[PDB]
């Protein structure tokens, strides 16, 4: 009864349709973010999910009161009766404001009219990716928010603390499979839209993809198939069906690895750093089969050496060369490939 | 300073009817539109649509909202848009769309002292495109957004792009992974129905598909599997197990390339440009294995009743015919 008429006095001459000080001054809305779980980063949609406790503090002059309580910890229904700044996400795609089991919003009013308004949000935000060094790349995923209707002359956003300490990521809530959150960078900007200039707060989450899955499923089958295609150099030259079955099948193996590993990626037009590795490893397997066709062209007989020993075929000079050359050149290429892209 | 502004807005809506079009018996109201596109998310060939995210904005003049004395532009809360008249503009391509609702419903009401009102929306829509994929993946596409009023005809409402050809912005900022926006157009026309003649605006893009994804995945192994079917012409005819096994493996690989690429693509009834190529390379693959059965039948079947000349002929002819096949193919569709 006592606290009801305090709240009813605040809503007598209050209009939630207009900004506090609509014709007098700007409205500073201090913002704070507590990231609970930096959720899974979808490569194919070029996006990332993030759960926050998005906090907003600002002073409203009309909500001054004098009562027993210094701060009023109130219901979320009154938050729909008070001016709330129309913050939107400049790169949000499909984001959820949770309401289980009640709308997850708290409104706290101090006795001088300073409002505290936090809400729990699941945000699916856009992250532009540069996959030229896939999978050994690192990129920044922005989280950018500002007012929707209110310009710089009306609503200015700020951070509650020093901006390096104004976005706090929780420790236990990682929720990442591939990437590795190295840290965040908090900055602030200004747009020039067709309706005016808007203050834009910005957080950049700096991710680095761990390459552990993409070595196991792509690189180690591609390396060991090149190691397969070099085993036929140690077979004899008279086994024409044995080396033909051997060589063409490892081309089919590299064909399967080419089209399957490209699927776990967007459909960009350039060649990723994994696609440079698969193309060259295909060329070692391609050249190993053309190596046998030169051996087969100069075989000059059809029978092999019986153990009791007529003239026989010598072990060819182009086979004794490719036992030394092609395993060495693949080892040199791995020194060139793995030092170029891991240094970046 | 501030309570006079509350008193002004409270008597703008005092006696306001949101069921009446502005000048309900008089001239039609002119609604000018302005689109600031954020992104184009996905362009699906299976679902035959595209996702468009845009800042969709509408100017019109309403004399019932005209205020006097206050020199500024009244930027009101988004909840007053439920208490005003707004146009019922829709999209015919619209499969599934939503106005964003985090952290609020992204509406804006900006009243001007002459009665002009801005109504801005941040809309992520999924507009449909029936795509002509007969030159896939070497083709240009045309995706359209069809803005039209629903319940007001051309005697009640009129549409115009605001700014001429500079109405829709943000098109140059769009970087798509496998397309390239060549040109966009702005079309204004009246579309007749049995109920009436309604005004329609049309934003329409031209999407030229980038081809570097398919040179890596589809064209380059189909070349090299076709080339490795030509190793059997440098192998003697006595090696029956060798020349058959590379010919059997090359007809298997062209099968597995076709089965992996039929899972990617929709149920088109025609033959695409990539299907002309994969079935085209399958002929040179399959003729390389019919060639050995032609050689094996002459020497071992019609023996007692040349064998080196047929191989020596086809060492030059089948690389020449396949290089001629790519010359016809890559100059027709490109």
């Amino acid at each position, epitope marked *: 009864t006592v606290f009801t008429r305090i709240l009813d006095r605040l809503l007598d001459g209050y209009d939630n349709r207009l900004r506090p000080g609509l014709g007098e001054r700007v409205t500073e809305v201090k913002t704070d973010i507590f990231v609970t779980s930096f959720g899974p980063v979808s490569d194919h949609d070029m996006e990332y999910t993030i759960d926050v406790f998005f906090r907003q503090s600002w002073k409203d002059e009309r909500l001054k009161f004098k009562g027993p309580m210094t701060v009023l910890r109130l219901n979320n229904l009154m938050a729909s009766k008070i001016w709330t700044p129309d913050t939107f996400f400049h790169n949000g795609k499909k984001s959820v404001a949770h309401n289980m089991t009640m709308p997850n919003k708290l409104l706290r009013i101090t006795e001088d009219g300073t409002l505290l308004y936090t809400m729990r949000l699941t945000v699916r935000a856009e992250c532009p990716m540069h996959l030229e060094d896939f999978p050994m790349d690192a990129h920044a995923c922005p989280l950018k928010f500002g007012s929707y209707a209110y310009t710089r002359a009306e609503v200015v956003y700020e951070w509650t603390r020093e901006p390096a300490r104004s976005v706090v990521v929780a420790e236990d809530g990682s929720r990442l499979n591939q990437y590795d959150l190295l840290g965040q960078t908090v900055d602030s900007g200004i747009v020039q839209s067709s309706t005016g200039e808007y203050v*834009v707060m910005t957080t*950049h989450f700096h991710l680095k993809r761990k390459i552990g899955y993409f070595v196991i499923q792509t690189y180690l089958p591609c390396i060991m198939t090149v190691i397969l295609s070099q085993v036929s150099f140690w077979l004899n030259r008279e086994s024409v069906p044995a080396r033909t079955v051997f060589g063409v099948t490892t081309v089919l193996t590299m064909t399967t690895l080419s089209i399957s590993a490209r699927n776990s990626l967007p459909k960009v037009a350039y060649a990723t750093a994994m696609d440079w590795f698969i193309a060259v490893c295909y060329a070692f397997v391609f050249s190993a089969l053309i190596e046998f066709a030169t051996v087969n062209y100069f075989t000059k007989r059809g029978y092999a050496w019986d153990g009791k020993s007529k003239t026989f075929n010598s072990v060819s000079k182009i086979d004794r060369l490719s036992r030394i050359a092609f395993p060495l050149l693949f080892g040199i290429f791995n020194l060139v490939y793995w030092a170029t892209y891991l240094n970046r | 300073n501030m309570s006079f502004v509350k008193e002004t807005v409270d008597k703008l809506l005092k006696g306001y009817d949101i069921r009446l079009r502005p000048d309900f018996g008089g001239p039609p109201v002119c609604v000018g539109m302005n689109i600031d596109i954020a992104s184009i998310d996905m362009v699906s060939e299976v679902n035959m649509d595209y996702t468009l995210t845009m800042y969709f904005q509408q100017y019109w003049r309403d004399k019932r909202l005209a205020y006097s004395g206050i020199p500024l532009n009244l930027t009101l809360d988004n909840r007053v848009a439920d208490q005003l008249w707004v146009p019922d503009t829709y999209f015919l391509n619209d499969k599934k769309s939503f106005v964003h609702g985090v952290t609020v419903k992204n509406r804006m009401i900006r009243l001007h002292p002459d009665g002009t009102v801005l109504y801005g929306l941040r809309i992520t829509t999924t507009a449909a495109c029936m795509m002509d994929l007969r030159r896939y993946p070497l083709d240009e596409q045309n995706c359209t957004l069809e803005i039209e009023s629903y319940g007001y005809t051309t005697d009640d409402i009129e549409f115009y792009w605001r700014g001429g050809d500079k109405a829709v912005t943000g098109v140059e900022r769009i970087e798509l992974p496998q397309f390239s926006i060549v040109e966009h157009r702005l079309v204004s026309r009246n579309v007749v129905f049995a109920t009436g003649a309604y005004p329609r605006l049309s934003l329409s893009f031209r999407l030229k598909r980038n081809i570097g994804y398919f040179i890596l995945q589809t064209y380059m192994p189909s070349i090299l599997i076709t080339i490795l079917s030509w190793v059997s012409f440098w192998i003697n005819y006595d090696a029956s197990a060798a020349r058959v096994a590379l010919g059997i493996t090359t007809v298997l690989t062209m099968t597995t390339i076709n089965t992996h690429l039929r899972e990617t693509l929709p149920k088109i009834p025609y033959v695409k440009a990539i299907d002309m190529y994969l079935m085209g390379c399958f002929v040179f693959v399959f003729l390389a294995l019919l060639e050995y059965a032609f050689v094996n039948y002459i020497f071992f079947g019609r023996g007692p009743q040349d064998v080196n000349a047929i191989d020596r002929w086809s060492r030059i002819v089948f690389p020449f015919t396949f290089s001629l096949f790519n010359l016809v193919y890559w100059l027709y569709y490109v």
Partner: nanobody
Amino acid sequence: GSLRVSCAASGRTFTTYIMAWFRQAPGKEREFLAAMDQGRIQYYGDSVRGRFTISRDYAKNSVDLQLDGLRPEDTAVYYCAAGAGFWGLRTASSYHYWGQGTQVTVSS
């Protein structure tokens, strides 16, 4: 007197990248001046917020720094950078494409 330093790009479309302006006084100090995101968001340095205005042209693939109110302390070499900023938008080591420099001299 005002000035407008321009930076035309070639060889790569920098629509998805971030193109930025730097300053280096005699004394070997690369200083951040301005940057613009893909979504047209202007990041300014602390000593220059309000004076210098950045404006990109996404069709011509260029970035333009509008120089307004040139005090004589801004006599330095202005560099044009273009990167995807990783630990960036203020760090010079997050821009892997560079201009050659422009000696902008303000005389008192």
